[PDB]
Structures are given as C-alpha cells and as structure tokens.
Write an enzyme that holds these catalytic residues in place. Structure first.
Site, PDB file in Angstrom:
ATOM      1  N   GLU A 432       0.977  -1.183  -0.028  1.00  0.00           N
ATOM      2  CA  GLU A 432      -0.008  -0.042  -0.012  1.00  0.00           C
ATOM      3  C   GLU A 432       0.972   1.213  -0.108  1.00  0.00           C
ATOM      4  O   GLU A 432       1.760   1.464   1.024  1.00  0.00           O
ATOM      5  CB  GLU A 432      -0.989  -0.075   1.097  1.00  0.00           C
ATOM      6  CG  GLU A 432      -2.131  -1.214   1.301  1.00  0.00           C
ATOM      7  CD  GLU A 432      -2.947  -0.977   2.431  1.00  0.00           C
ATOM      8  OE1 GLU A 432      -2.736  -0.150   3.342  1.00  0.00           O
ATOM      9  OE2 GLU A 432      -3.976  -1.731   2.509  1.00  0.00           O
ATOM     10  N   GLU A 492       9.689  -2.950   5.657  1.00  0.00           N
ATOM     11  CA  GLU A 492      10.657  -3.347   4.518  1.00  0.00           C
ATOM     12  C   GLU A 492      12.103  -2.427   4.757  1.00  0.00           C
ATOM     13  O   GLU A 492      12.574  -1.971   3.736  1.00  0.00           O
ATOM     14  CB  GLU A 492      10.076  -3.007   3.151  1.00  0.00           C
ATOM     15  CG  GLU A 492       9.088  -4.085   2.543  1.00  0.00           C
ATOM     16  CD  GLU A 492       8.406  -3.499   1.527  1.00  0.00           C
ATOM     17  OE1 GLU A 492       8.424  -2.675   1.020  1.00  0.00           O
ATOM     18  OE2 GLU A 492       7.559  -4.293   0.920  1.00  0.00           O
TER      19      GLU A 492
END
Lengths: 982, 328
Positions: A432, A492
């Site tokens: 997203e 991440e």
C-alpha cells in the site's frame, strides 16, 4: 460465451468457478495420507506433463475452432506443464519496477495482447462418472478460458490463487479433450503491479479430483486455548453438501490418541474436542497435532498447531511472551524456471535461512505455493501472508467504488485458502502506498472472518503501525512518545542493494533496548538475475535491460542477500551476527568472568557452549571450552573461563585478544555438531654506523636515484612520486604511484554519484608546485613536495604537502598534510595507489577478516592474522562495483608466492585493498564478463573511506560514516621485504 | 531395517582441525487396480515396432533388436535412443596389464544378435516379450549367450529378467549391464545406498549408507588421465530425473551398481587429457549387475579373485518405473 472480451469487462471476474475453500487432498486411508504424495491417491489424477502448445503474438490471430474435439494438433509445439513460457523461447523477458508496463487506461489492455493455446487429451475410468469430478489449477498468469470436449466450461482471472471448476456435465468414460486459452494481460493487471519479472502461462500444478455426491466441502479448524494457555479445544467447523456421518480423531506429536468423535452433519456444523495439557507451536519448537476426518470413501488429514497472537499494552505477544520478529522478504524466483519452484529448492532456502538465525518470512506481494506453507509449519517460521494486490496506480483505483468486488475477492480467496496453517500469524492486505476505501473493506472482511490473527495494511480499528524505511532517529522518536499506543513494525527496512546493508547494528541496538518495537523484515532474500549465455561461453546472470525490453529498471532487481545460485553475500553474515540469540559481555574480564544473556523467547541455552581462545597477533597461546550454558529465556548467567594472565602476559608484552564463540552441541537438521552461532572478542592489556657509507644519491633529468647497501629507489622529482623500488635487484613497483580520491560507486551511491560526477571528481590530476631534496646528517634522504589535486574545469580539490623519507635500511616514509575545499560534498576516499608487478599473488595481513569490512558494515568480521590470494580478495557482484577493502588493518604484506614484496604500516590503522582491477575498470564495466583481468596487482592504502549505507532507497549515509573531514595527516610506512627470512 | 551410525568426533580445536571434526565412523544394522486400468491396454505392431499404450503411458519396443526404444509417461519422453547391453568400461590405470587381453579378445566393441523374438499378452493385460540373443564382436566366437524376458504391466513398469552364460576361455569381463540414454535436462540423481562418493567391490571403506541427492556433474571425478569414474556400489534404489522431478526409478532383486554421467564409455576411453572430453547434452545411465574392482595392478599384485568378475552363469532381475517424483 465465446470471446466477448471478459478480460476488459470488470463486471465479469469469472464464469462458472467454484467458491473458495481450504487446501486438502482426499485420500483413501490414513497410511497413504501420511505420505503427502497426492499421486498415490485413487481419487486424484495428475495433468502435469507434456501438452500441445501454440503461441500467438495477438489474440486477434487465434483460430476460432481450436477447442473442438476432432482438430489436428500434431504440428503444434510440445510444452511441459508447469512452466513459464518466457523461459522456453517465447516472448522476450521483461523486468519493470512500480511503473505499469501498459498504458494506464483502466480497464483496457493493449490490442497486441499475446496468447497461448494448450491442448491435452486424457482418459477417465468407469467408476468416475458415478461421482463428482472437479479440475483444479493451482496458478495461471493473468486470465484463462477453459473447454472440455469442445464445450465451454469456464473462465477465470487471478494469477496467484487457485481456480476450481466442475466437470460432471462435460466428461465421459474413455478419451477426453481439454483446451485452455491463456492471455498475458487482463483487467487484473492493474492490481498486479509487482516489482518482479513478468512471466506468463500455466506455471503451477493442474489436477483432477473425484469427490462423491455427498462430501465434506470445507473445513476450518480453530485452536481455542484458554486465558492462561492451560486448556485446549479443537473446534473443527465442517461444511458439507448433505447428510454425512463423519469420524474424527486427534493425535499428539508423539503419535497417541487423545480424542475421537462421530457426528452427523447436514450442511454446516462443528465438532469440538478437548485437549487437557496442550503442547504449543512456535518457531523454535514446532509441535503439531494430527487431525484425521473420515467420511464415506474419503480421508482428510490436517496438521494443527496451538498458538495465540495478541497485542496487550502496545506490546506484540505470541503465547504470552514478548517476541521480536527477525525476518526477510521473499519472492518466488528461480534463475532458470522463473516462478516455477520445485520442492528441494524451497527446502534449501529454508535450511539456509534457519542456519542464519532467521525466524520470520514475509511472502512479498502475493501468496506462495500451498506446500511452502506446509514446509514452514514443519521447520518453524512466522509467516506474514500478503495478498496479490499492488495497485501502484498513480488515478487511485483504491477510492473507485466500482473496483470494490475486485479488491475484496483477492483477500477472500487468499484467507480462505490458508486459514488452517499454524505458521501464519498476520494477514497483510498487500503493498500500500495509498489509503483508500477498498483496502478498509478487505480489512473489515478479514477481521470479521478470522479473529485469531492480526491484520496488516500499510496506508493506515487498526492492529499495528508500519513504516517503510525509517531513520534510526525516527524509530527512537516513536518509541519514547506517549501517544504511541500501537507497536511499531519495520516493514521493509535496510535495502540490501549492492555491497551489503549499511548501519544494521544501529537499528537493533534500539530495537533490543526498547519495547513498542516488534522487529522487522530486511528487503530482499535473493538477487533476481536470470541465467544467460554469452556468444563466448562464460555464462552469467543478466538483469533488466539486456533483452531490448522497455522500460528498463536495470539494477533495481538485484538487491538481495544471496546470489542467484544461493551463495551467501557478506550481508547475511552481518545479519547473522546482529540478530544472534546469545549475548556475551564483560564482567571484570581480568578475572575471567562473563555475562551471558539469553535472547531466545522459549528456549534455554542447554544445547550451547562457549569455546574460548587467547591469542597474540594471531598466534594462539591458550584455549579451552566451557561446560554448558543454562539460562532461561530473558535471563543472565555468569560464566568463568580458566585462562591465566601470569603465563600469557610474560611472553612478548603486547595486547592480547580473547575470542569467545558460541557453538552448538547436537546435530540439527540444518547444521552439524560444532556449528557456530555467534562470536565475541575482548581486548586484554598486557646499524651502529656500518651501512651509512653505502648511501649514494644522484639526479638526472629530474629523476632522483638513491642507492644504498642492498636497495635502489628512483623518485620522480617533477611529479613528487616514487617510480622504482628495488630490493636485492628485484623490482617491486611496475609504474608510477599516485594519490587517488575515486572509488567505483556502489549501488547505495545512486544519489551522491551525480554530485561527484558533477563536481569533477571522476578523474583528477596532480600539480606539483615545488620539489626539494636534501640529505640529513645521518645519510637519510628527505623530499619535500607541495602539490594540489585538481580536475580540468573547477577550483582544485585538495591542497597539501608531502614529505618522503628514505632511510639507510630502505624504508620509505610518507607524511602528507592535506586540506580540502570547503564547498565539496564528501570525498569517496583518499589514499596512495601503487602498482606491483606480475606474480604478486599472496596477501597476508593482521586485522579484521576474513572478508570485507567498512566503517558501517563490520559486524561480521573478527581480528586475526589472515593469509589469502588476490583472487580471493575479490567479491564478484552482478553489477561490478567497489569491493575487497579491509577496514582497520594493522599491517599488511603483498608479495609473490616465494615471499618477495612490500610491507605497509601506519601510525593509526588504515584501510587496505588489493585487486587485479583498477577503479576505472570497475566503474566502466556493467556486467561480469566485461571485466578484463590485469596481470599486475593494484594495491591501495586508504586513510579513511566512506561507508556503504543503505541509500538506494530510504535514508542517506550517516554523518560519522561519511568522509567529512577537511584537514588530516596520513603517516604511512613502506618496507621492502623478503618474507621467508625478513 | 534400521541403521545406527556412530561417528567419533573430537572436542577441542587442534591447529589443523576445528571442534566437531570427525575421525572415524562405524555403522550397524538393526533388525526390525481392482480391474479398472486393464481395459486401456492396447497393443499393435508395425515394421517390427511393438507399441504398447496404457492408461497414462506409451512404450515402443524394437522387436528385431530386443530393446525398448521409447518410454513415455503423461506424454513426456524418457529415453533418447535405443537401450543396449554393455560389457566395456573405460580402463583404469590399475588395468594396464589386463587391457591387452581385453583388446586382444575383442571386447572393445561388441554388437548384439537376436535369434528369436516373440511377444504375447498374459490374461491380466500384461505384455511379455521373449528374446534369444548373443553378444559378439567381429572375428571371434560370441562372448555372452543368453535370453531375456521383458514385461510391461498395467501401471507401466518395465521388468527385465535376463539369464546369460559367458564363454569359457575368456579372462573376466569388465562389467555386464544395461545402458539407457535419457534426454536433455535430466540433472538430479537421488539414490539410497552407499555414498556420498564413489565406491567399488574393493574400494568401499570410506562410504556410508544413506539417502543422497546430487547432480550429474557432481557424480564425475575429473582425473588427470580420463578413466572410469562415478559408480556407486550396492545401491538399493536410484532415481534419475529433471529438476522438476520427472524421470525413472530403478530397483532390483539384490543391490546393483549404478552410474550416471554426461560421457559414454568410449568417450572416456578415447580421450587422453581433461580438455579432450566434450560434454554431451544427454545423461548416460548404467545399471550394472557386477563390476570388477580397482585393485593396485599398476605395480605389484593383480586383482584378487573375489574382486574379479569371474562368474559364467547369472540372473539379473531389474525393474524400471516411470515416475513424477513430487507426487509419485
């Protein structure tokens, strides 16, 4: 319904596809079901193998009657299913980043839409038309149509999720005919914009099931642990198609009956069962119960794990304990098969992860094959299971209300498929970058359906807060705040693009000392380079832009922790040391007492011991091993090592080094007995006027020649550099020395390289203002040089002065003081570059090794005395860049195999490099085959050197890791040496 | 049957070896479809080619040479060319004296002579092929005379039962086996037996029993003088397949010798250096009954009598099964 463009419709997502269920295979007995091989079941027939295939550059030019039963398919090609057709000689390979490789015109896809036709015959027995027959496709890229015996049976769409169809009105006993049309692009391509190579075809398994007329249709198993984790209840919600008498039995991991039940379920109902003292599931003790369901002719086998995932006070908890998740992200990528992954290639990845202290895996941007999760239930890994949705858009399909049924079903089909897996802990709603009204519908359906797991969505009734690439200052701002009620998960972090991840110890130093921080996932596991031949026969790995594909996002695909043939980079060893579950620290090291901290969550340290070693300058004095360790999770033990400082310190009066290595004691399935988990090092504090008459000096044409007792050195006075260095007549330099301020830029230097090349640091020269030589009153020679480093348009970069000194034994001492310009960003390096002749092949140094290390990437190296070759200094990356440098070197010798060379010392420890490639050769090259190996050996002695960092995506290089210093002294010493007698 | 393995491992770091390094190992043995697919069996014969189709297979035998030519499973081809019997190996460096008798007797290259071939169909839709054959080279009396029975069942297994006698004035054969040639892409080997490296009847003290998985390029041991290599003695079963697991499985009555290379025996015989070996795309699989050992006959005593292949009447009993290994 033949070809009405359902692949551009958005109101036709499927035709005739059965609704989603869990993952199971109907067997015939409990003995066959425990094998796992579904081809042994009489109710299952495979359709893998060799099909007849025809490729079309457009859907326009496909024949209109290929699906008919009496057509001649003999001139077609033959393709092995499962396989992606981009790795089989069909249309050219294509890598794309977050941009769509189609015009953004929803829901329309280009007219040149490539297509493939598959045809396969099969047989079917007599006792199969008396029951229900289904076909299951585990995965097909984009969309596909389906025809059985020349009759239209289905259409489906969705690339990473199975599709099941009903074949009872269509098949007959004897020979049959199956025809599939597969398209490359559909309207679901807008929801599949993953940063990965784009493959096409039937790439997963295909089979046929024979289920009887009243069968168990769906099973959802629920562990129902109590509030103090002391009572267990297995609730098996069974959804049938009619009236079934169902047997059920449950077994422990040891293989003992603990429950048995019979029920009569008439369409939807549960079968509860009690477990008095349950054995819980976790990543390091993966204990699994066995459930057997029996109905009619069918036997279903499930593997149940009891766990509870929660958040209490902003603290993420698994089974009551607070757990920090230490994981990587993973794409399914094979360098020869694309997205077709065999089983052993998964088992190798899981073993290599588990022997590097990793306990979490995030399935990056799509769900994987259903047996990868079966393996992850057995090895022990926490799974964050993402949905197949990446509408990088850029617009905003997330806020468009007529896309809502497409957004919702990609979560419904995922959650229904993987709901009985004991390793999945978090449902993630995909990548997203935009908060939208369609992601919250996915989250609300998922939270209403499954309440035993947490729900993740990045754009942000939320469960956890997520950040992609923070700074190390940002998360310690978040942790100390009082308005932070949710735990923080690094989504991440630490992009590993190039020469390892920088500043990785910095994140974990503040993850460990703080709560409200539940860990994270490092960017990538592998490099995605695909195996390619050259016309010379020196096969390499290619990246994007090597096949004429548009657009090219070239080296953005590499960014991994392992090579494509699964060799570890130095970035795995950094991670392995950083996230190691045992800490050792000092407890008045002079006596020999040490604190040992357990960082496991559920395991004591009874399987480990500490092997210690005292040494001086790499030479061992004493060694031993402790008995065993005993610490409970979260607790600290005191150990005492029996070494003696009285005997050891009275040997040579130098600093001593103790090394303590945590080694295991039993064979794991992934590692042997003496395998090492962590290491920790500790510091322990502990010629008469005969050769001055052979010194002769002369000068001709600016060449200052200095002869001595057993040496001869030639300096160039008009460039301020030594040209020849000899010892017993042996030449030791091949050409002129220089100063160097340029390195081959790393992949974490994509932003700073434009300022370096714009400022003209790409190639600079040297300007000597004044040179002057003397002879001191001890037959010692001094040379004073005033110099400047400059390129050809701008103001000079470095201004300084150097003093070369030649002594009566032949040493060459350098003392350069330099200032650098004030409006210059920061230099890559500053050093002295020498070039030694052909045959210099051994390197022997005392410092940190045995592999590469920098100012910020140095957590995996240890201090010692190392000996290797110049070909082993080099680390052959896919994109050629700077490599092989050893930080904090005390001394180093570069010599031939007989030991005739040079020795380098300094005042404070320097950086050292030795290669067969100059920096301009590594800069100009773009692939591995373009590097031509030089006969000489390029040796570089750096003062400081700017680190790696993670500036490919995220924060830039930190201030103590840059080379931001504008006045320094260098103090190098060079000595000719014959190493075997010194 | 269960297997116990006891490995003697050290405990401290020596200057030459680390903590868990192994000195010795010792192993010990511990004692512990309903008439639905027989209707799809079809048989025909054109030009001596016997084609047998079944439920999910198709096998083509050559009746005039007594050998299978094509083996298929779900349409996937599994043989590249015709099978044969082989009695020649590339001679080792301990075979400098016996090679003159082997080459003088004409065992360097022999052919096959089929006397009589006959096929049937048993009353369970099972196919039997009876072949009377002989192995001979082009000047002398024939070496091996025997007869073979090939059998194809309803599931697709191929069973071989060859009884053979060999000539009485012949020294001892290098090997006797069945040589198959599997297509391009067959790269995984997985076998249950002694490993992980080479072993023979006399050189087998360093291998241990287990379940091993490797590649065909790792079966090969690249000597300076190219010679016979890569054979695993006392194999229980073995699977040679592609990386996705589509291949063949080999069993026998008693444990056999197994070899898989990218080089045929004549390529290793004709080559003299390492660069002269050209790697073939295919994969040469060999299933040996017995095989004469290495010895030390370069200088000193010759090969011992229980280590030679001095036996003149034997039975072989091989079984070949097409397999898709990931679901069996």
């Amino acid at each position: 319904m033949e070809l009405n463009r359902e692949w551009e419709n958005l109101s036709c997502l499927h035709i005739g596809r059965l609704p989603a269920r869990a993952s199971y295979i109907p067997y015939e007995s409990a003995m066959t079901a425990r094998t796992g091989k579904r081809g042994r079941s009489p109710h299952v027939q495979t359709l893998n193998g060799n099909w007849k295939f025809r490729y079309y550059r457009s859907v326009r030019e496909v024949d209109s009657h290929f699906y008919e039963t009496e057509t001649d398919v003999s001139g077609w090609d033959d393709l092995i299913v499962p396989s992606c057709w981009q790795t089989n000689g069909y249309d050219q390979l294509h890598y794309t980043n977050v941009n769509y490789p189609i015009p953004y015109d929803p829901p329309f896809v280009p007219d040149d839409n490539p297509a493939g036709t598959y045809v396969r015959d099969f047989n079917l027995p007599e006792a199969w038309t008396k029951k229900q027959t289904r076909i299951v496709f585990e995965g097909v890229n984009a969309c596909f149509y389906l025809w059985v015996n020349g009759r239209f049976v289905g259409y489906s769409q969705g690339s990473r999720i199975p599709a099941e169809f009903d074949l009872t009105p269509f098949v007959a006993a004897g020979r049959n005919r199956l025809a599939v049309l597969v398209l490359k692009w559909c309207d679901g391509t807008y929801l599949e914009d993953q940063d990965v190579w784009r493959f096409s075809g039937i790439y997963r398994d295909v089979y046929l099931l024979s289920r009887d007329n009243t069968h168990i249709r769906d099973v959802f198993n629920q562990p129902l642990l109590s509030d103090d984790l002391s009572e267990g209840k297995l609730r098996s919600e069974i959804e049938t198609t009619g009236s079934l008498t169902i047997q059920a039995e449950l077994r422990d991991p040891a293989g003992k009956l603990i429950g048995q039940k019979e029920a009569q379920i008439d369409g939807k109902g549960a079968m509860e069962l009690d477990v008095p003292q349950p054995q819980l599931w976790n990543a390091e003790q993966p204990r699994l119960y066995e459930l057997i369901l029996t109905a009619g002719q069918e036997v279903l086998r499930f593997r149940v794990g009891f766990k509870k995932v929660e958040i209490t006070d902003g603290i993420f908890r698994i089974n009551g304990r607070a757990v920090k998740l230490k994981g990587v992200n993973r794409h399914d990528s094979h360098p020869e098969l694309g997205q077709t992954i065999p089983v052993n290639h998964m088992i190798a990845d899981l073993k290599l992860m588990k022997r590097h202290n990793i306990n979490t895996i995030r399935t990056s941007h799509y769900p994987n094959d259903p047996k990868f999760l079966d393996l992850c239930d057995e090895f022990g890994f926490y799974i964050i299971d993402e949905a197949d949705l990446e509408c990088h858009g850029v617009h905003k399909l997330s806020n468009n209300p007529d896309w809502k049924e497409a957004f919702v079903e990609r979560a419904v089909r995922m959650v229904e498929r993987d709901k009985n897996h004991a390793s999945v802990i978090i449902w993630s709603m995909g990548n997203e970058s935009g908060y939208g009204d369609n992601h919250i519908a996915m989250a609300e359906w998922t939270k209403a359906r499954d309440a035993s797991r947490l729900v993740h969505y990045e754009g942000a009734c939320l469960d956890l807060d997520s950040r992609m690439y923070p700074s190390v200052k940002e998360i310690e701002r978040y942790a100390l705040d009082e308005n932070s009620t949710k735990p923080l998960f690094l989504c991440e972090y630490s992009h590993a693009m190039g020469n390892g991840p920088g500043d990785l110890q910095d994140y974990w130093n503040v993850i460990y000392r703080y709560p409200k921080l539940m860990g994270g996932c490092v960017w990538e596991w592998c490099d995605h380079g695909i195996a390619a031949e050259t016309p010379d026969g020196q096969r390499y790995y290619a990246y994007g832009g090597d096949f004429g594909d548009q657009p090219n996002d070239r080296n953005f695909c590499i960014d991994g922790l392992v090579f494509p043939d699964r060799r570890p980079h130095t970035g795995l060893l950094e991670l392995k040391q950083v996230i190691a579950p045992v800490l050792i620290e000092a407890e008045d090291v002079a006596q020999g007492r040490f604190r040992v901290l357990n960082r496991y969550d559920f395991s004591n340290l009874s399987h480990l011991a500490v092997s210690w070693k005292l040494e001086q300058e790499g030479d061992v004095l004493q060694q031993g091993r402790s008995g065993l360790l005993t610490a409970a999770p979260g607790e600290t033990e005191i150990i005492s090592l029996p070494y003696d400082l009285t005997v050891a310190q009275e040997e040579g009066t130098g600093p001593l080094t103790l090394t303590c290595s945590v080694r295991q004691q039993l064979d794991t399935p992934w590692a042997e007995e003496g395998y090492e988990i962590a290491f920790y090092q500790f510091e322990l504090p502990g010629q008469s006027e005969e050769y001055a008459g052979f010194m002769t000096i002369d000068e001709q044409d600016g060449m200052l020649t200095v002869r001595g007792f057993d040496f001869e050195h030639v300096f160039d006075l008009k460039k301020g550099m030594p040209q020849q260095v000899s010892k017993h007549g042996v030449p030791l330099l091949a050409s002129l020395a220089r100063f160097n301020i340029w390195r081959a830029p790393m992949d974490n230097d994509m932003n700073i390289r434009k300022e370096w090349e714009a400022a003209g640091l790409d190639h600079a020269a040297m300007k000597v203002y004044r040179s002057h030589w003397e002879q001191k009153p001890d037959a010692s020679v001094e040379i004073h040089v005033d110099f400047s480093l400059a390129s050809y348009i701008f103001e000079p970069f470095v201004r300084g002065n150097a003093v070369w000194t030649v002594g009566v034994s032949g040493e060459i001492q350098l003392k350069v003081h330099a200032e650098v310009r004030e409006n210059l960003p920061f230099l890559p390096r500053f050093g002295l570059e020498l070039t030694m002749p052909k045959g210099t092949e051994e390197i022997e140094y005392y410092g940190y090794g045995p592999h590469e290390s920098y100012i910020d990437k140095r957590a995996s190296v240890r201090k010692g005395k190392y000996l290797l070759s110049v070909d082993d200094m080099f680390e052959n990356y896919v994109m050629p860049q700077e490599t092989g440098s050893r930080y904090g070197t005390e001394w180093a010798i570069a010599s031939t195999v007989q030991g005739m060379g040079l020795k380098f010392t300094a005042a404070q420890p320097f950086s050292f490099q030795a290669l067969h490639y100059t920096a301009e050769d590594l800069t100009a090259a773009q692939h591995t085959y373009e590097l031509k190996r030089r006969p000489e050996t390029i040796v570089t002695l750096d003062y400081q050197m700017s680190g790696t960092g993670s500036g490919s995506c995220g924060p830039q290089l930190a201030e103590p890791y840059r080379f931001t210093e504008k006045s320094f002294d260098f103090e190098l010493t060079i000595q000719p040496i014959f190493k075997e007698e010194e």
